[PDB]
Amino acid sequence: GPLGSSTIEERVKKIVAEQLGVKEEEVTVEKSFVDDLGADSLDTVELVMALEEEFETEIPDEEAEKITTVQAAIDYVKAHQA
């Protein structure tokens, strides 16, 4: 966002864009990491870790299995903040 302001949504979308090597603009909330954004097994392992670091949160491996979309990653991060 302007002058370094950024929402949880924008921060998830930037981390996903960086990790999966796609335009921030192709990272919409409806997107599947695997089916839409071409994440392989290693991409997903590293993406979990990049989200954990950005948001200073622990995503347990079995929660991480269910986070199949950009929307789920936003809702998980928002829930472990509020």
Q: What was the experiment behind these coordinates?
A: X-ray
Resolution in A: 1.7
- Say whether 36 is catalytic: no
Looking at 40, 43, 61, 75, which residue is catalytic?
40
Contact of 42 with 20, CB cutoff 8 Å:
no
Which CATH architecture group holds 2-79?
Orthogonal Bundle (1.10)
Q: What is the Cα–Cα distance from 47 to 1, expressed in whole angstroms?
A: 21
Q: What is the Cα–Cα distance from 34 to 36, expressed in whole angstroms?
A: 6
Domains in the chain: boundaries: 2-79
Q: What is the Cα–Cα distance from 58 to 27, expressed in whole angstroms?
A: 23
Contact of 54 with 11, CB cutoff 8 Å:
yes
